[PDB]
Design an enzyme around this catalytic site. Structure first.
Site, short mmCIF file in Angstrom:
data_model
loop_
_atom_site.label_atom_id
_atom_site.label_comp_id
_atom_site.label_asym_id
_atom_site.label_seq_id
_atom_site.Cartn_x
_atom_site.Cartn_y
_atom_site.Cartn_z
N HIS A 178 16.43 12.20 -35.65
CA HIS A 178 16.30 12.13 -36.25
C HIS A 178 16.98 13.53 -35.91
CE1 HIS A 178 12.48 13.72 -34.19
NE2 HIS A 178 12.91 15.22 -35.57
N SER A 206 -1.19 -5.88 25.18
CA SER A 206 -2.75 -6.11 25.83
C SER A 206 -2.57 -7.41 26.25
CB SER A 206 -3.82 -6.38 25.54
OG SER A 206 -5.17 -6.86 25.80
N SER A 212 -4.84 -9.52 25.79
CA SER A 212 -5.39 -10.55 24.21
C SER A 212 -4.26 -11.16 23.12
CB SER A 212 -5.88 -10.02 24.04
OG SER A 212 -6.00 -8.78 24.20
N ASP A 223 13.15 5.78 -34.05
CA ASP A 223 13.62 6.92 -33.64
C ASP A 223 14.28 7.90 -32.82
OD1 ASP A 223 14.10 9.46 -35.08
OD2 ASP A 223 12.26 10.35 -34.72
N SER A 282 10.33 18.32 -30.63
CA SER A 282 10.69 17.08 -30.87
C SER A 282 11.66 16.05 -30.22
CB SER A 282 10.81 17.38 -32.31
OG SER A 282 11.44 16.24 -33.18
N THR A 315 -6.98 -2.86 26.20
CA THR A 315 -6.85 -2.66 25.33
C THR A 315 -7.31 -1.92 25.21
OG1 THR A 315 -7.26 -5.42 25.63
CG2 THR A 315 -6.76 -4.26 23.34
MG LIG Z 1 -6.21 -6.48 24.20
#
Ligand SMILES: [Mg+2]
Ligand SMILES: *[C@@H]1O[C@H](CO)[C@@H](O[C@@H]2O[C@H](CO)[C@@H](O[C@@H]3O[C@H](CO)[C@@H](O)[C@H](O)[C@@H]3O)[C@H](O)[C@H]2NC(C)=O)[C@H](O)[C@H]1NC(C)=O
Ligand SMILES: *[C@@H]1O[C@H](CO)[C@@H](O)[C@H](O)[C@H]1NC(C)=O
Ligand SMILES: *[C@@H]1O[C@H](CO)[C@@H](O)[C@H](O)[C@H]1NC(C)=O
EC number: 3.4.21.47
Lengths: 142, 228, 48, 714
Positions: D474, D228, D230, D524, D647, D303
């Site tokens: 363990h 655009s 702008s 552990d 475990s 736009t």
């Molecule tokens: Mg624009």
């Protein structure tokens, strides 16, 4: 909005402001006074700037405005008007939208064909005519 | 060739351009008067195509008096070359005739002594492979000098993790490396061809994964054989 | 109008708690006469 | 014609004409900013653009005002000092929480020159809700104190300030607020190029590491550039160059997405379509990005953003059910000023797009991770309200950016290209059709140990790297040799040969026999270095570990995130929702639990007295070291209990579609597992303890140094 010459370039910028969503050339088909909301049923003749509402020429859209402003609008049926509004002026769920004529809605009488031959409307019909093509072909600048 | 330079026109007569269907595919090197050494994996996507070799060229598009497009008379990929691995990735291409030697065309001496290249040695590598990660195909020949990293370090877990055989050599790739399209390119370590570009696929420039090249010296036997 | 403060440069009150200052304090200051003393600097709310 | 310069000056400052006098920019001294607007356009009426504020108000004279940082006008569960009508630059304010409340976030914050407060938002939470306290970003106001499930909150910004992010956030299942953290923006705050590039990529790369599962070419990137009038040729060409380096940056990851290039004005212009056979060709797309020019849309400099997004819609749409649609990530990136004046609200398209991709249209399957929208403010005048309404709102991610100088992004992207950094793959799990177990838990490792008639030890672990398998300590003993220890992963029938088992230096299970404590599961943890390198597949993948660069991206945090910050994220001061994998009749199944790290931590720890042997322990804290996380129980819910076979398993925290291991299943109080079923009558004190990984980092970081996990210093 307002009411001291509102030239062509004036209409261009005002109609391309971020807020402005839709821009139509409508014909006031019917006018109603019903309980809560007042009703202006317009018929879109041409979509100068397609808004967020998918509407084609020939369809009808209902507009709403308080009574206190009815005196200022003095709208008469069968007459054409150039109007644009903000995207924050919609009302209801689609496809049953309803435009609201708020303090930020532009409304202008559009002198019909045979009336543009008057030495008082020739200065207006040229501005509007020029405003239309400029907004259709090129669209909003920037 | 990431972070490379535009080589001077025909400053590398040995440089060849293996082309499939009139389009660059791999890099090649003129090791003999009628032989071009390259990467074997280049003919994996060929099959239905017309393989050729462009010698004495610098620009692949612009006309040059020294340019000439030879036809492949025979393609001899090393017997032990699989598409699955990089091991033994050599290819010998015999031209339709002896290459017209000139200021822009000349064979290159290749190492026979099977001894690892001294770590830190600057080697020159060229090709028409992409120059950026986007995949831009260069029109002119590119080159770059690279330090030779010792196999000891290249085999670290942080790098290639011992995947480097005694028949392969490494070269630093810290943002400067031979990328896709350079496969089969010459790795000249002092006027002498020591290795051939071959690293399959990676992400060019990854310092943590140095470039892999096939040592021609460790294949002298097979080479001499073919050229007979 | 011409005088007074702008209706924009006016910072309105808002903090009107029913209770606050729910904190803790330890008295480690140099004890004189067995009476330690702290001096807290607190900020009063907007409530009147 | 050129607008008159009469009465355009600004009090306490000057200005400079740009774009050949078609626009001016106010120049204010150090510490001040142009008010109301920064720049002004030259309308086709001879007069300059009207001085509109943030509240759309009109101002007669322009003034250079001192820069202030948004004053806190709402704060709960604590106090902040000092309170002032406004805060100048370099002003400091600190936060403190009431009793019983924990403080997370920056305690002291300083008002910086960018009109923003330093550090992170201060939040005083009690960790008593399903979700934590969303907090109240400085400058905003939160409406909603209930933090239960399904509950919501709303944020509002002071007058004259624009809200960036989400205005409403809902507490979603799995302990995580929807949308993103709000932020009150002003009319001069901008964003430094680095900040943008840093946040834009920390959000993009992540949604790419996942795309590797695995032409081609399974992600789409729609580049919508605004041409655009702008924006001006200056802020336009700079936007292309930024995109160019972005494509290269992406390419450096070795990923080839499908691109779609579109520049728009009064009408959309398609340069590259994802359906094209060259969309995935990065070089192709780049050549186009170069051919386009700002003069392309000069004749019709409208736009109409709506039609631009409609162009993208038709690219991702179908002629009516492609095989690969519910597996494709869509990424829309558009540069604009947010000033649209044709077509209306562009948001309507975004919604239509979401409907097309079946997003947010299923409670159980949001599919939000399949669509990202990034919006970059480029033009001189940028509407932060509109560009924020299009950009996505994802937790801990930023999609809205207002580039300051621009062009610098280009130079930052180029500087941020590093081929050495690898693409993460930890904690990845995708809904594959077959979905055989080990597809849902690829990191899951099954450890077995054979002993002379004594029996077989059954434990579990997790694949943390290509060589290591993190498990409990363990499960093994100094007597157990490598030949009697077999590990199996990915559900493979065969058993892998191990190289060595690395125990933690401080692991001594018998270091309490004097005090009368048989077991002592402190530290552990142990690692198992395999003899062979693992080939990551659909059944074998690593799991993310705390304090690693790879994990930071998973949590979508800034690269500058310290180790301490990660712990506050993963293990906050509350009831953290977690899970672990258990074996259910030769079938892996997940079990959701709650890590009692809040005030319930004490209630959970002391229950260790009921454990076998600990019955006569003087001080219960002597057997539950700070290296333990506590889960299980009845409050706030009835958690499943770990089994003997579980475990050593990982204690995982599922957040943002990623799995992060934060513990190792050590020991439980009551043995509800008994190879026949699960003791349907579990006690209330049946707790389970684990090893907090944030406590054994030194050991992990050291032993995994050559694994490219990128641990953080700290
Ligand atoms: Mg624009
Ligand atoms: C927020 O601000 C306060 C104020 O600085 C921070 O508390 C402060 O902590 C520091 C570090 O211990 C203390 O610094 C001290 O400075 C004096 C100056 O003479 C020096 O003698 C001491 O050796 C020490 O270095 C400071 O006393 C202390 N302020 C107090 C207690 O009033 C606080 O840490 C900050 N919050 C953050 C950023 O976490
Ligand atoms: C902040 O700076 C402004 C401008 O210099 C000044 O007027 C004001 O008094 C300062 N704020 C304080 C601390 O009162
Ligand atoms: C399409 O993908 C979704 C992803 O949620 C998956 O659930 C679904 O099974 C897939 N469709 C088919 C037919 O498998």
């Amino acid at each position: 909005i307002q009411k001291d010459k509102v030239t062509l370039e004036e209409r261009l910028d005002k109609a391309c402001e971020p807020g402005v969503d839709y821009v139509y050339k409508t014909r006031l088909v019917k006018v109603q006074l019903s309980n809560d909301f007042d009703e202006y049923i317009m018929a879109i003749e041409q979509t100068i700037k397609s808004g967020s509402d998918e509407v084609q020429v020939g369809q009808q859209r209902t507009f709403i405005s308080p009574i206190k402003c009815r005196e200022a609008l003095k709208l008469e049926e069968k007459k054409h008007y150039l109007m644009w509004g903000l995207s924050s002026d919609f009302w209801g769920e689609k496809p049953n939208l309803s435009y609201i004529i708020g303090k930020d809605t532009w409304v202008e009488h559009w002198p019909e064909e045979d009336e543009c031959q008057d030495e008082e409307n020739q200065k207006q019909c040229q501005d509007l005519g020029a405003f239309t093509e400029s907004m259709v072909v090129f669209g909003c600048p920037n | 060739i990431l972070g490379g330079r535009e080589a001077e026109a025909h400053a590398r007569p040995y440089m060849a351009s293996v082309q499939l269907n009139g389009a660059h595919l791999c890099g090649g090197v003129l090791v003999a008067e009628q032989w071009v050494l390259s990467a074997a994996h280049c003919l994996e996507d060929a099959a239905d195509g017309k393989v050729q070799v462009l010698l004495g060229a610098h620009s692949l598009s612009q006309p040059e008096p020294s340019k000439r497009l030879y036809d492949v008379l025979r393609a001899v990929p090393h017997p032990d070359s699989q598409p699955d691995t990089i091991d033994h990735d050599l290819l010998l291409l015999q031209l339709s005739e002896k290459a017209t030697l000139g200021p822009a065309v000349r064979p290159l001496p290749w190492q026979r002594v099977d001894r690892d290249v001294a770590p830190g040695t600057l080697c020159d590598v060229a090709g028409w492979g992409i120059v950026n990660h986007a995949g831009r195909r260069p029109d002119s020949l590119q080159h770059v000098l690279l330090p030779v990293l010792d196999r000891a370090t290249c085999n670290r877990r942080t790098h290639h993790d011992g995947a480097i055989t005694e028949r392969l050599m490494c070269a630093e790739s810290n943002r400067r490396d031979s990328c896709k399209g350079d496969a089969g390119g010459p790795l000249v370590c002092g006027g002498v061809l020591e290795g051939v570009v071959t690293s399959g696929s990676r992400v060019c420039g990854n310092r943590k994964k140095p470039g892999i090249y096939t040592r021609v010296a460790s294949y002298a036997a097979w080479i001499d054989s073919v050229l007979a | 109008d011409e005088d007074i403060i702008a209706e924009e440069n006016i910072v309105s009150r808002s903090e009107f708690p029913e209770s606050w200052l729910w904190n803790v304090e330890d008295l480690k200051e140099p004890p004189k006469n067995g009476i330690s003393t702290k001096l807290m600097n607190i900020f009063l709310k907007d409530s009147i | 014609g050129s607008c008159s310069l009469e009465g355009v000056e600004i009090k306490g400052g000057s200005f400079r004409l740009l774009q050949e006098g078609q626009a001016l920019e106010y120049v204010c001294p150090s510490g001040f900013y142009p008010y109301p607007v920064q720049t002004r356009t030259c309308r086709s009426t001879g007069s300059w653009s009207t001085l509109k504020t943030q509240d759309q108000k009109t101002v007669r004279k322009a003034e250079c005002r001192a820069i202030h940082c948004p004053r806190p006008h709402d704060f709960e569960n604590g106090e902040y000092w000092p309170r002032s009508p406004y805060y100048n630059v370099s002003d400091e304010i600190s936060f403190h929480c009431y009793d019983g409340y924990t403080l997370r976030g920056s305690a002291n914050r300083t008002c910086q020159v960018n009109g923003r407060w330093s550090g992170q938002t201060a939040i005083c939470d009690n960790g008593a809700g399903y979700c934590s306290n969303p907090g109240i970003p400085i400058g905003t106001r939160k409406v909603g104190s209930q933090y239960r499930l399904e509950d919501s909150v709303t944020y509002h910004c002071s007058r004259g300030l624009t809200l960036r992010g989400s205005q409403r956030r809902t507490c979603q299942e799995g302990g995580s607020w929807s949308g993103t953290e709000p932020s009150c923006q002003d009319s001069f705050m901008y964003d430094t190029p680095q900040e943008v590039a840093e946040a834009f990529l920390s959000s993009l790369t992540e949604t790419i590491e996942g795309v590797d599962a695995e032409p081609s070419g399974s992600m789409n990137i729609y580049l919508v550039l605004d041409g655009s009038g702008s924006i001006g040729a200056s802020d336009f060409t700079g936007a292309k160059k930024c995109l160019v380096n972005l494509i290269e940056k992406v390419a450096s990851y070795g990923v080839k997405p499908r691109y779609g290039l579109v520049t728009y004005a009064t009408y959309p212009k398609i340069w590259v379509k994802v359906s094209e056979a060259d969309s995935s060709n990065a070089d192709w797309v780049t050549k186009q990005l170069n051919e386009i020019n700002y003069e392309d849309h000069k004749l019709k400099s409208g736009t109409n953003t709506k039609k631009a997004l409609q162009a993208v819609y038709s690219m991702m749409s179908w002629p009516d059910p492609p095989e690969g649609w519910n597996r494709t990530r869509h990424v829309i990136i558009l540069m604009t000023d947010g000033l649209h004046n044709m077509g209306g609200d562009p948001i309507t398209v975004i919604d239509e797009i979401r409907d097309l991709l079946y997003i947010g249209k299923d409670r159980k399957n949001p599919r939000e991770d399949y669509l990202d929208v990034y919006v970059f403010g480029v033009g001189p005048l940028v509407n932060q309200v509109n560009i924020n309404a299009l950009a996505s709102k994802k937790d801990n991610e930023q999609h809205v950016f207002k580039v300051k100088d621009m062009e610098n992004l280009e130079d930052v992207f180029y500087q941020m290209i590093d081929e050495s950094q690898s693409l993460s793959l930890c904690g990845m799990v995708w809904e594959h059709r077959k979905g055989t177990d080990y597809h849902k838990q690829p990191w899951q490792a099954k450890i077995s140990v054979i002993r002379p008639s004594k029996g077989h030890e059954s434990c579990m672990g997790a694949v943390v790297s290509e060589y290591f398998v993190l498990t409990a300590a363990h499960c093994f003993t100094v007597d157990d040799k490598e030949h009697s220890i077999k590990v199996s992963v990915g559900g493979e029938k065969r058993d892998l040969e191990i190289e060595v088992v690395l125990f933690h230096p401080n692991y001594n299970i018998n270091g309490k026999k004097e005090a009368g404590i048989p077991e002592f599961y402190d530290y552990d943890v142990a690692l198992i270095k395999l003899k062979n390198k693992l080939k990551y597949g659909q059944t074998i993948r690593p799991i993310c570990l705390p304090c690693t660069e790879g994990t930071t991206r998973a949590l979508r945090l800034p690269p500058t995130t310290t180790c301490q910050q990660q712990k506050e994220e993963l293990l906050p001061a509350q009831d953290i929702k977690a899970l672990f994998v258990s074996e259910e009749e030769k079938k892996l199944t997940r079990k959701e639990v709650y890590i009692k790290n809040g005030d319930k931590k004490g209630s959970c720890e002391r229950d260790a007295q009921y454990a076998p042997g600990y019955d006569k322990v003087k001080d219960i804290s002597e057997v539950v070291t700070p290296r333990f996380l506590c889960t299980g129980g009845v409050s706030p819910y009835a958690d499943p209990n770990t089994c003997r076979g579980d475990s050593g398993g990982p204690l995982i925290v599922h957040k943002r579609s990623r799995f992060i291991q934060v513990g190792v299943i050590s020991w439980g109080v009551v043995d509800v597992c008994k190879n026949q079923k699960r003791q349907k009558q579990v006690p209330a004190h049946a707790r389970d303890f684990h090893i907090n990984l944030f406590q054994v980092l030194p050991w992990l970081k050291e032993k995994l140094q050559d694994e490219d996990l990128g641990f953080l210093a700290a």
